[PDB]
Amino acid sequence: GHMIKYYNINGQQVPVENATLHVSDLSILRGYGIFDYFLAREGHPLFLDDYLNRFYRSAAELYLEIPFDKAELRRQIYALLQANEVREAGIRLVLTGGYSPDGYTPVNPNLLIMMYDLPASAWEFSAQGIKIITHPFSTGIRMLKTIKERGATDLIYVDQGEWIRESARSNFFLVMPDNTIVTADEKILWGITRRQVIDAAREAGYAVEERRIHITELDQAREAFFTSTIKGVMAIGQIDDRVFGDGTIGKVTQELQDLFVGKVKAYLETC
Amino acid sequence: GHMIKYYNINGQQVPVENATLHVSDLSILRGYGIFDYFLAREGHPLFLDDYLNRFYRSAAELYLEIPFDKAELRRQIYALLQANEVREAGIRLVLTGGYSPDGYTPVNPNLLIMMYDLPASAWEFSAQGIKIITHPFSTGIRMLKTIKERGATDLIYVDQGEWIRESARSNFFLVMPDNTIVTADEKILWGITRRQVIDAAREAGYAVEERRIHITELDQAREAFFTSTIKGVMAIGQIDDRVFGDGTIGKVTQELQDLFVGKVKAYLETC
Ligand SMILES: Cc1ncc(COP(=O)(O)O)c(/C=N/Nc2ccccc2)c1O
Ligand SMILES: Cc1ncc(COP(=O)(O)O)c(/C=N/Nc2ccccc2)c1O
């Protein structure tokens, strides 16, 4: 793996061993802050402008002012890849509520850029679908316990015992026997992987329905998968007691996995 | 005011100027953590055992292990009051998700004890009730904006357009014309001030109903008030367009304010 030498705090490259915040930061005291996370390959953060747009939208929703414009943040991110001498990386952006003279009032958010090594494994996909559970409904990390204990590696939620509700971590998709792709709607552009995969499905001539999913629809679907930054397209083989196909990646899920890699390749060709 | 010289990080008294966490702390990266906040007067944290019990319960709910038992944490808190040479103080306890070798897995929570000066003003109460709004339903600090903009200093929530829902920051009480005190129920002991004030009301021979409050009940109440650690008993003079009495503290709210001071005096007599 790779020694990461530097993070970035408020536009200054800081050796990892000195990368600290004073405990008056409102993320420490009150968990007030936003983040984004994205990959880089061949020295380029993937779909970067979409991630940065999401990051600036998240900040404005919390009334936190990012201390640099998008072009400047983009420069800092590329400057940090070059300083750490990595071509493949995970990049975390953090905007805290910042240092507050009174432990409550945001007065100046703190901006962190952190960097991680990816194993070659990060870019590979399993033919074996994962096993998840449904669950009525901090919440997300708390839930790791219940999850591992039940022999699942993730979950989706049911609402009023009726409606599938996505976790924070992933977008959830069904493929119906007629090859209709079904996924929850969005008010504004949140899922970056979700967007590239819906685009790839429609370009391939698949029907994509963006709508509420009823619990009964898990029993009608041929395939189930997640999208996320880290997973890309990840096949779900089992939901509670429901096996999808033989538990291995479905036909459309496999096609969308390959088309997503195509979207990442096409993105990198424009860099 | 008072120079605070020291905080406590993981059982070590640290000069405030050196009190920092490495950015791998999961409170910085993911807002994963708990806290408690309480006052001290005459060199004693108020109702300390109830606050510590709440703190240990909050931690166990997030599967975070506090590195010291209750007696040891209590010692650290008194040792910090003595090191800062303060008799009147605000004390914040923070337990973060801690430093994680992979930015996701809690591996060792970090414990912070921070200390603040109280103005003599912190112990005084206003005869003038505050002005709040109702509102359908991070959320809490985000809401300061809407609040100040509407000429309110706080809010309570309405659920399904039907039921009063308390904010995180305060417990909400009505006093009906027959002097029935009404407040939302609790599953386990959360509000410390709430508990002392309900105890004081019942000892005085008032009826206290712990139950769901319907929106229509704001129109039937003679008085409205908040309890919290910082506010003690705080009169609410106006909710949206509803003035309570002439906007000044009601009879029962004033009696409960005096009885709460009595509970604090009695507590300090046992120290
Ligand atoms: C540009 C690019 N080129 C090839 C592969 C596959 O190399 P091969 O076809 O020889 O195995 C990937 C995989 N991404 N996988 C991925 C991307 C984002 C998130 C998760 C997985 C890629 O991103
Ligand atoms: C022990 C004790 N003794 C007196 C006063 C009042 O002094 P006087 O009656 O002469 O004005 C207070 C006020 N607490 N107020 C308070 C306590 C907790 C939270 C908020 C307010 C007190 O806590």
The domains of chain B are located at 2-127, 128-266
**Quick check: A22 and B22 CB within 8 A?**
no
- Which of B171, B197, B261, B271 has the most ligand 2 atoms within 8 A of CB, as the residue to mutate? B261
One-letter amino acid at A235 equals A
Strand pairing class (A181-183; A6-9): unpaired
Q: Is A41 in the pocket of ligand 1 (CB under 6 A)?
A: yes
Task: Tell me the β-bridge partners of A213.
Answer: A164
- Which of A46, A227, A260, A261 has the most ligand 1 atoms within 8 A of CB, as the residue to mutate? A261
H or E segment at B62? none
Output the known binding site of A.
28, 54, 192-193, 229, 246, 248
Interface test mutation site (partner B, options A27, A62, A111, A153, max chain B beta carbons within 10 A): A27
What's the resolution in A?
Answer: 2.0
> What's the token pair of residue B156?
């309570």
Pick from B28, B142, B145: which is nearest to A21 by CB? B28
User: What's the rounded Cα separation, in Å, for the pair A73 and B46?
Assistant: 46
Answer whether B4's CB lies under 8 Å from B86's CB: yes
Distance B198 CA to ligand 2 centre (A): 18
Residue A242 neighbours by CB distance under 10 Å: 13
Nearest CA to ligand 1 atom 18: A232
Answer whether A46's CB lies under 8 Å from A90's CB: no
Please give the span between the terminal C-alpha atoms of chain A, in angstroms, as a whole number.
Answer: 25
Is B229 labelled a binding residue? yes
Q: Three-state SS string across chain A, please? A: CCCCCEEEECCEEEEHHHCEEECCEHHHHHCCEEEEEEEEECCEECCHHHHHHHHHHHHHHCCCCCCCCHHHHHHHHHHHHHHHCCCCEEEEEEEECEECCCCCCCCECCEEEEEECCCHHHHCCCCECEEEEEEECCHHHHCHHHHHHHCCCEEEEEECCCEEECCCCCEEEEECCCCCEEECCCCCCCCHHHHHHHHHHHHCCCCEEECCEEHHHHHCCCEEEEEECCCEEEEEEEECCEECCCCECCHHHHHHHHHHHHHHHHHHHCC
Distance B47 CA to ligand 2 centre (A): 14
**Quick check: B28 and A28 CB within 8 A?**
yes
> What's the token pair of residue A203?
């370009």
> What's the token pair of residue B195?
């508990």
Strand pairing class (A181-183; A208-210): parallel
DSSP code at position B250:
P
Ligand nearest to the CA of A230: 1
CA pseudo-torsion sign A142, A147, A153, A155: negative
Catalogue the E-assigned strands of chain B: 6-9, 12-15, 20-22, 33-41, 44-45, 89-96, 111-116, 130-136, 154-159, 163-165, 171-175, 181-183, 208-210, 213-214, 223-228, 232-239, 242-243
Long-range contacts of A51-57 (CB under 8 A, 24+ apart): A51/A93, A51/A192, A53/A189, A54/A189, A54/A190, A54/A192, A55/A93, A55/A95, A57/A188
Task: Tell me the β-bridge partners of A8.
Answer: A13, A113
Helices A192-203 and A48-61: crossing angle, nearest 10°?
A: 130
Answer whether A58's CB lies under 8 Å from A97's CB: no
Distance of CA B197 to the CA centre of its chain: 13
Strand pairing class (A154-159; A130-136): parallel
One-letter amino acid at A165 equals R
Ligand nearest to the CA of B230: 2
Distance A127 CA to ligand 1 centre (A): 15
Among A114, A115, A95, residue whose Cα is nearest residue A25: A95
Partners of residue B31 in chain A, C-beta under 8 Å: 27, 31-33, 138
Nearest CA to ligand 1 atom 13: A123
Task: Tell me the β-bridge partners of B183.
Answer: B173, B210
Q: What is the CA radius of gyration of chain A?
A: 20
Q: What is the SS3 assignment for B210?
A: strand
User: What's the rounded Cα separation, in Å, for the pair B111 and B96?
Assistant: 7
One-letter amino acid at A237 equals G
One-letter amino acid at A167 equals S
| Residues listed for chain A | 271
Q: Is B158 in the pocket of ligand 2 (CB under 6 A)?
A: no
Number of DSSP helices (H) and strands (E) in chain B, helices first: 7, 17
Nearest CA to ligand 2 atom 11: B124
User: Residue A125 burial (CB < 10 Å; 0-12/13-18/19+)?
Assistant: middle
Ligand nearest to the CA of A192: 1
Tell me how the structure was determined: X-ray
Partners of residue B9 in chain A, C-beta under 8 Å: 23
**Quick check: A61 and B33 CB within 8 A?**
no
> What's the token pair of residue B243?
């003035």
Q: Is A242 in the pocket of ligand 1 (CB under 6 A)?
A: no
**Quick check: A20 and B22 CB within 8 A?**
yes
Answer whether A103's CB lies under 8 Å from B114's CB: yes
The HSE-up count of residue A146 (CA atoms within 13 Å, CB side) is 14
| Closest chain B residue by Cα to residue A102 | B116
Task: Tell me the β-bridge partners of A234.
Answer: A226
Answer whether A137's CB lies under 8 Å from A186's CB: no
Distance B189 CA to ligand 2 centre (A): 23
Find the chain A residues whose C-beta atoms sit closer than 8 A to any C-beta of B: 7, 9, 19-23, 25-33, 35, 61-63, 92, 94, 96-97, 103-104, 106, 112, 114, 116, 138, 141-142, 145
Residues ≥6 apart with Cβ < 8 Å to B265: none
Q: Is B197 in the pocket of ligand 2 (CB under 6 A)?
A: no
DSSP code at position B229:
T
DSSP code at position B219:
G
User: What's the rounded Cα separation, in Å, for the pair A150 and A132?
Assistant: 9
User: What's the rounded Cα separation, in Å, for the pair B74 and A24?
Assistant: 22
Residue A226 neighbours by CB distance under 10 Å: 25
User: What's the rounded Cα separation, in Å, for the pair A259 and A255?
Assistant: 6
Smallest CA–CA distance, residue A219 to chain B, in Å, is 31
Q: Is A37 in the pocket of ligand 1 (CB under 6 A)?
A: no
